[PDB]
Amino acid sequence: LTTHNFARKTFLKLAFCDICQKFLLNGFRCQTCGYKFHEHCSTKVPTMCVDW
Ligand SMILES: [Zn+2]
Ligand SMILES: [Zn+2]
């Protein structure tokens, strides 16, 4: 992986926050690995980008 990303935007499909446990809503998703998360996930999320 290389560098993460965080842009405020809404998803055009059902998503899910890997930091919390249920679907995800309009939050911040990385447009490189496909990350997504609410406000409880802005401290552990910024440090990863492993996408296959
Ligand atoms: Zn990323
Ligand atoms: Zn979350």
- Where residue 34 sits, what CATH number does that domain have? 3.30.60.20
23-29: long-range contacts, CB 8 A cutoff, minimum separation 24: 29/5
Q: How was this structure determined?
A: NMR
Positive or negative, the CA dihedral 21, 4, 33, 49 is negative
| Ligand nearest to the Cα of 27, by number | 2
CA distance linking residue 52 with residue 40, whole number of Å: 25
- Total of domains in the chain: 1
Q: Residue 8 in 3-state DSSP?
A: strand
CB 45 within 8 A of CB 15: no
Compute the distance from residue 19 Cα to the ligand 2 centre, in Å: 5
CA distance linking residue 3 with residue 26, whole number of Å: 22
User: Which residues participate in the annotated binding site for Zn(2+)?
Assistant: 4, 17, 20, 30, 33, 38, 41, 49
Enclosing domain of residue 17: 1-52
| Ligand nearest to the Cα of 29, by number | 1
Q: Which of 33, 32, 36 is nearest to 10 (CA)?
A: 36
